Amino acid sequence: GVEIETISPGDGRTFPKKGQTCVVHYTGMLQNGKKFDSSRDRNKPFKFRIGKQEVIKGFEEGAAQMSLGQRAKLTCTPDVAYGATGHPGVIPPNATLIFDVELLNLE
Protein backbone atom coordinates (compact mmCIF):
# COMPACT_ATOMS: atom_id res chain seq x y z
CA GLY A 1 0.00 0.00 0.00
CA VAL A 2 1.26 3.42 -1.09
CA GLU A 3 -0.36 6.55 0.35
CA ILE A 4 0.52 9.89 -1.25
CA GLU A 5 0.03 13.14 0.70
CA THR A 6 1.48 15.72 -1.64
CA ILE A 7 3.27 18.92 -0.81
CA SER A 8 1.99 20.63 -3.92
CA PRO A 9 4.28 22.59 -6.20
CA GLY A 10 5.51 21.38 -9.57
CA ASP A 11 3.67 20.56 -12.79
CA GLY A 12 1.55 17.47 -12.13
CA ARG A 13 1.99 16.11 -15.66
CA THR A 14 5.52 14.75 -16.25
CA PHE A 15 5.19 11.29 -14.92
CA PRO A 16 7.96 8.67 -14.78
CA LYS A 17 7.74 5.91 -17.38
CA LYS A 18 9.58 2.71 -18.24
CA GLY A 19 13.16 3.03 -19.41
CA GLN A 20 13.53 6.37 -17.62
CA THR A 21 16.16 7.25 -15.01
CA CYS A 22 14.95 9.59 -12.28
CA VAL A 23 16.59 11.59 -9.50
CA VAL A 24 15.24 11.69 -5.94
CA HIS A 25 16.34 13.50 -2.77
CA TYR A 26 14.82 10.91 -0.47
CA THR A 27 14.68 11.10 3.32
CA GLY A 28 13.68 8.16 5.48
CA MET A 29 11.88 8.04 8.82
CA LEU A 30 10.79 5.26 11.14
CA GLN A 31 7.26 5.36 12.55
CA ASN A 32 7.53 6.44 16.22
CA GLY A 33 11.29 6.39 15.81
CA LYS A 34 14.25 8.32 14.50
CA LYS A 35 15.79 8.68 11.06
CA PHE A 36 17.50 5.74 9.43
CA ASP A 37 18.43 6.98 5.96
CA SER A 38 19.09 10.24 4.16
CA SER A 39 20.23 11.43 0.77
CA ARG A 40 20.29 14.95 2.19
CA ASP A 41 23.49 14.14 4.08
CA ARG A 42 25.63 12.76 1.26
CA ASN A 43 24.35 15.35 -1.30
CA LYS A 44 24.42 12.60 -3.96
CA PRO A 45 20.87 12.61 -5.29
CA PHE A 46 20.39 8.82 -5.82
CA LYS A 47 20.16 8.38 -9.58
CA PHE A 48 18.04 5.32 -10.35
CA ARG A 49 15.90 3.95 -13.18
CA ILE A 50 12.38 2.54 -13.33
CA GLY A 51 11.33 -1.09 -13.68
CA LYS A 52 14.41 -3.06 -12.61
CA GLN A 53 13.25 -3.68 -9.00
CA GLU A 54 16.29 -1.80 -7.74
CA VAL A 55 14.40 -0.05 -4.93
CA ILE A 56 11.88 -1.69 -2.59
CA LYS A 57 8.29 -2.15 -3.77
CA GLY A 58 6.72 0.57 -1.62
CA PHE A 59 9.17 3.20 -2.86
CA GLU A 60 8.73 1.93 -6.42
CA GLU A 61 5.01 2.68 -6.83
CA GLY A 62 5.30 6.05 -5.08
CA ALA A 63 7.97 7.11 -7.57
CA ALA A 64 5.52 6.75 -10.46
CA GLN A 65 2.69 8.58 -8.67
CA MET A 66 4.62 11.88 -8.63
CA SER A 67 5.69 14.48 -11.17
CA LEU A 68 8.50 16.97 -11.74
CA GLY A 69 9.24 19.27 -8.82
CA GLN A 70 6.69 17.61 -6.54
CA ARG A 71 7.24 16.58 -2.93
CA ALA A 72 5.25 13.62 -1.68
CA LYS A 73 5.04 11.78 1.65
CA LEU A 74 5.09 8.00 1.36
CA THR A 75 3.77 5.44 3.82
CA CYS A 76 4.89 1.89 3.09
CA THR A 77 3.34 -1.27 4.48
CA PRO A 78 5.56 -3.95 6.08
CA ASP A 79 4.87 -6.56 3.41
CA VAL A 80 6.27 -4.43 0.56
CA ALA A 81 9.66 -3.48 2.05
CA TYR A 82 11.20 -5.70 4.75
CA GLY A 83 8.54 -6.77 7.20
CA ALA A 84 9.06 -10.48 7.67
CA THR A 85 12.83 -10.32 7.17
CA GLY A 86 13.99 -6.91 8.33
CA HIS A 87 17.16 -5.32 6.98
CA PRO A 88 19.79 -6.55 9.46
CA GLY A 89 20.56 -4.04 12.18
CA VAL A 90 19.01 -1.11 10.29
CA ILE A 91 15.35 -2.03 9.72
CA PRO A 92 13.68 -4.21 12.38
CA PRO A 93 11.26 -6.99 11.45
CA ASN A 94 7.63 -5.87 11.01
CA ALA A 95 8.48 -2.24 10.29
CA THR A 96 6.33 0.51 8.79
CA LEU A 97 8.11 3.05 6.63
CA ILE A 98 7.87 6.82 6.11
CA PHE A 99 9.64 8.66 3.29
CA ASP A 100 10.08 12.32 2.48
CA VAL A 101 10.49 12.17 -1.30
CA GLU A 102 11.22 14.95 -3.77
CA LEU A 103 11.21 14.11 -7.49
CA LEU A 104 13.67 16.39 -9.31
CA ASN A 105 14.40 14.15 -12.26
CA LEU A 106 15.53 14.28 -15.87
CA GLU A 107 14.42 12.47 -19.07
From Swiss-Prot:
Summary of the tissues where the protein is detected: Detected in heart muscle (at protein level). Isoform 1 and isoform 2 are ubiquitous with highest levels in brain and thymus.
InterPro entries: FKBP-type_PPIase, PPIase_dom_sf, PPIase_FKBP_dom
Catalytic activity: [protein]-peptidylproline (omega=180) = [protein]-peptidylproline (omega=0)
Modes of activity regulation: Inhibited by both FK506 and rapamycin.
Enzyme Commission number(s) from the entry: 5.2.1.8
Gene Ontology terms for molecular function: calcium channel inhibitor activity; calcium channel regulator activity; FK506 binding; peptidyl-prolyl cis-trans isomerase activity; signaling receptor binding; transmembrane transporter binding
Main localization (coarse): cytoplasm
Subcellular localization: Cytoplasm; Sarcoplasmic reticulum
Main EC class the enzyme belongs to: isomerase
Domain of life: Eukaryota
UniProt KW keywords: Cytoplasm, Isomerase, Rotamase, Sarcoplasmic reticulum
An example Gene Ontology CC term for this record: Z disc
Ranges of residues in domain PPIase FKBP-type: 19-107
SUPFAM superfamilies in the record: FKBP-like (SSF54534)
UniProt-listed GO biological process terms: 'de novo' protein folding; calcium-mediated signaling; insulin secretion involved in cellular response to glucose stimulus; negative regulation of calcium-mediated signaling; negative regulation of heart rate; negative regulation of insulin secretion involved in cellular response to glucose stimulus; negative regulation of release of sequestered calcium ion into cytosol; neuronal action potential propagation
Function: Has the potential to contribute to the immunosuppressive and toxic effects of FK506 and rapamycin. PPIases accelerate the folding of proteins. It catalyzes the cis-trans isomerization of proline imidic peptide bonds in oligopeptides.
Assembly and oligomerization: Identified in a complex composed of RYR2, FKBP1B, PKA catalytic subunit, PRKAR2A, AKAP6, and the protein phosphatases PP2A and PP1. Interacts directly with RYR2.
Entry similarity comment: Belongs to the FKBP-type PPIase family. FKBP1 subfamily.
Protein name (Swiss-Prot/TrEMBL): Peptidyl-prolyl cis-trans isomerase FKBP1B
Record organism: Homo sapiens (Human)
